[PDB]
Design an enzyme around this catalytic site. Structure first.
Site, mmCIF file in Angstrom:
data_model
loop_
_atom_site.group_PDB
_atom_site.id
_atom_site.type_symbol
_atom_site.label_atom_id
_atom_site.label_comp_id
_atom_site.label_asym_id
_atom_site.label_seq_id
_atom_site.Cartn_x
_atom_site.Cartn_y
_atom_site.Cartn_z
ATOM 1 N N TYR A 18 -13.289 -3.324 4.829
ATOM 2 C CA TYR A 18 -13.941 -2.298 4.018
ATOM 3 C C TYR A 18 -13.630 -2.500 2.543
ATOM 4 C CZ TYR A 18 -9.274 -0.273 4.965
ATOM 5 O OH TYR A 18 -7.916 -0.081 5.143
ATOM 6 N N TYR A 26 -9.925 -4.288 1.696
ATOM 7 C CA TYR A 26 -8.875 -4.319 2.695
ATOM 8 C C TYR A 26 -9.460 -4.689 4.050
ATOM 9 C CZ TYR A 26 -5.034 -2.066 0.001
ATOM 10 O OH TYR A 26 -4.031 -1.789 -0.899
ATOM 11 N N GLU A 71 5.799 2.693 3.938
ATOM 12 C CA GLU A 71 6.050 1.240 3.920
ATOM 13 C C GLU A 71 7.477 0.881 3.474
ATOM 14 O OE1 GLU A 71 2.869 -0.390 1.546
ATOM 15 O OE2 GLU A 71 1.342 0.740 2.634
#
Lengths: 178, 161
Positions: A18, A26, A71
């Site tokens: 996308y 990404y 993350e």
């Protein structure tokens, strides 16, 4: 032509590419119920890629799915997939240090967790770079769950095209080049 | 189905909500305008905390579903997805480690203590984050209109039960 997404099972195992409205491209894979792999082709951290990222995955309502994760860099992500409209919305909350030193994170993250953790403690966390953007989905593939081929090498310039053109994966959704 | 159908962003803006997360946390929350939210926490880890004029990104994902993203003086990140037509929401709150360690610091009228929040987020640990991604039941909705400064304050709005 595309199947209607109605359940969690419909979504899990799907491989997406996308483009956000800021131009960032990404690639993202719902590898299983609590795991995501992804690969970044365009934007501030293009070249960066990630496997085995633990995430919370829910269907919010029929055919709409929300994914939440944090993350090793300290970045927070909330993605909303609307596959039936070929649309997504993602908000990424970047620590200040990722905005100022994005190159540190442009790598196979799995090979450099310690560098991510040392960097997030060494450099500034605030103010956050908040990036809330809609995206258009340009590719969806049914990879199955726990398919370790889907995201298993660094991105290269032609890769999104190769994937969309059916040049990258074989009949079992495994890498032709491996 | 006594409740009006939410279909546009304007339908959502001006709405005053109360909701309870599956874990028991209870929030009162107000979409004051297209980029601004006010809220008060009634139960859970940081009950007593409240906030006005929190800048936020507010979008309609699809007809009747609304996403709100913001980041806080404490360093906390928030993504809320409201489904008012189903009287449901899903929130993800990403707390820095220090808020879990010292929640009482954040329990105040945040607007008067921005300095304390910012100083605290530099002083104490950020990692590992406490991530709370949860569904909530919406138990109240009111149409307060936009830019209504009486909705969230020390005193009760109580133009309602």
């Amino acid at each position: 032509m595309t199947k209607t997404f109605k359940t969690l099972d419909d979504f899990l195992g799907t491989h997406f590419i996308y483009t956000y409205d800021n131009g960032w491209e990404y690639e993202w894979y719902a590898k299983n119920d609590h795991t995501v792999d992804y690969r970044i082709h365009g934007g501030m951290v293009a070249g960066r890629w990630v496997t085995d990222q633990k995430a919370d995955i829910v269907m919010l309502t029929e055919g709409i799915y929300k994914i939440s994760w944090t993350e090793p860099t300290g970045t927070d992500v909330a993605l909303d997939f609307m596959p039936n409209e070929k649309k997504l919305h993602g908000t990424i909350f970047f620590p200040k240090w990722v905005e100022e030193h994005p190159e540190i994170t442009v790598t196979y993250q799995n090979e450099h967790i310690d560098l991510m953790e040392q960097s997030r403690e060494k450099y500034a966390t605030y103010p956050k770079l908040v990036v809330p953007e809609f995206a258009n989905i340009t590719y969806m593939g049914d990879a199955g769950q726990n398919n370790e081929d889907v995201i298993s090498e660094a991105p290269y310039k032609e890769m999104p095209n190769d994937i969309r053109n059916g040049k990258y994966f074989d009949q079992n959704y495994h890498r032709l080049n491996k």
